[PDB]
């Protein structure tokens, strides 16, 4: 959680009920400005996985990038001639889904004239997934490390990185865009995880033109996929729905529990898929092999959802998502040039925008 400094000046406070009423209907599908990278095909044998046909989770080490907006060389180039607001899908999803968030987060905004850059701070846990964040009683750091919030987060994050690569068909020729991955040399591209980037543009009215990096994890025989893993750590301690007993006949109830307890995580995943234009959101259901060990996991189920329809199922309204973003953009455009910080208050349902000194970070 970022340390609020005494020389930070509050510009605006926004409570969740106000944010929840915001709307900007009519925003079009993103327009591709540049597409990059090479993505692997999904292995449809994983469609046969179920509780009676579980598969061990494999450890597959590939490199993942989560480059912030201003360090992205494609965004730097595009900003010379295109748009006036810049971000990435992960940063946008955090803002757009803020009214679902509980745990703290922050985003830095730099304003130069009529251009805005939204970034994450360097060396933070911004990328980590949360676990049971929106439970009535979230996990507490009361005990050893096995089920602490921090360890649960790293466990979920690790599970997701492995799952997304395991379900790929490594021998199938990849789908390659004309431009390669911008975060690695061609000579070494073999070592990066399967990913395709779409740098997309949106008209948000009032002359606001957003450019942001979006991505897909895989392709399917061409359909583009966003691949994510739900995970079960200890169902009893989580007071959850035991997956090995309930996935066969009550898969919907299991998902419903996930939605209640991981509301922000699931919405941010859905926004990521919608921003990229993925045709499907592919979920794995991954559980510990034993509740007492967080290093070994099994895949119990797989499912796919069309992102537009799934958004409606989790009560995510993109008209509201864009409305929230537009509200924040408008506030920033009215400020003096310089740096600003938006943050979610760790103990209250509100976000605050601060005027921070330019050399703060
Ligand atoms: Cl998350
Ligand atoms: Cl304002």
Curated annotation (Swiss-Prot):
GO terms for cellular component: eukaryotic 43S preinitiation complex; eukaryotic 48S preinitiation complex; eukaryotic translation initiation factor 3 complex. Component of the eukaryotic translation initiation factor 3 (eIF-3) complex. The RNA gate region regulates mRNA cap recognition to prevent promiscuous mRNA-binding before assembly of eif3d into the full eukaryotic translation initiation factor 3 (eIF-3) complex. The keyword Coiled coil does not apply. This is Eukaryotic translation initiation factor 3 subunit D. GO terms for molecular function: mRNA cap binding; translation initiation factor activity. It comes from Nasonia vitripennis (Parasitic wasp). GO terms for biological process: cap-dependent translational initiation; formation of cytoplasmic translation initiation complex. Belongs to the eIF-3 subunit D family. It is found in: Cytoplasm.
């Amino acid at each position: 959680s970022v340390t609020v400094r005494p020389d930070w000046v509050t510009i605006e406070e926004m409570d969740f009920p106000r944010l929840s009423k915001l709307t900007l209907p009519g925003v079009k599908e993103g327009e591709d400005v540049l597409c990059c990278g090479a993505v692997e095909y999904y292995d449809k044998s994983y469609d046969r996985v179920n509780v009676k046909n579980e598969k061990p989770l494999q450890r597959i080490d590939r490199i993942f990038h989560t480059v912030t907006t201003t360090d992205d060389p494609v965004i730097r180039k595009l900003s010379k001639t295109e748009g006036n607001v810049y971000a990435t899908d992960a940063i946008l999803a955090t803002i757009m889904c803020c009214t679902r968030s509980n745990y703290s987060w922050d985003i830095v905004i730099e304003k130069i004239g009529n251009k805005l850059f939204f970034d994450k701070r360097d060396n933070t846990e911004f990328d980590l997934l949360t676990v049971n964040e929106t439970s009535v009683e979230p996990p507490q750091d009361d005990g050893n490390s096995l089920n602490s919030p921090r360890n649960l987060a790293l466990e979920a994050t690790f599970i997701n990185h492995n799952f997304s690569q395991q379900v790929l068909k490594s021998n199938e020729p990849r789908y390659k865009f004309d431009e390669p991955n911008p975060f690695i040399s061609e000579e070494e591209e073999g070592e990066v995880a399967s990913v395709a980037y779409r740098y997309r543009k949106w008209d948000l009215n009032n002359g606001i033109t957003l450019i942001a990096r979006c991505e897909h994890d895989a392709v399917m025989q061409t359909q583009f996929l966003t691949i994510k893993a739900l995970n079960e750590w200890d169902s009893k301690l989580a007071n959850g729905v035991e997956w090995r007993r309930k996935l066969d006949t009550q898969r919907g109830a299991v998902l419903a529990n996930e939605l209640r307890n991981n509301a922000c995580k699931l919405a941010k995943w859905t926004v990521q898929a919608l921003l990229a234009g993925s045709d499907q959101l592919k979920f794995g259901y991954v559980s510990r092999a034993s509740v007492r060990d967080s290093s070994k996991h099994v895949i119990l189920e797989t499912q796919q959802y069309k992102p537009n329809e799934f958004a409606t199922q989790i009560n995510l309204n993109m008209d509201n998502a864009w409305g929230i973003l537009r509200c924040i953009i408008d506030i920033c455009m009215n400020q003096k040039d310089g740096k600003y910080l938006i943050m979610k208050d760790p103990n209250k349902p509100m976000i605050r925008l601060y005027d921070i000194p330019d050399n703060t970070f």
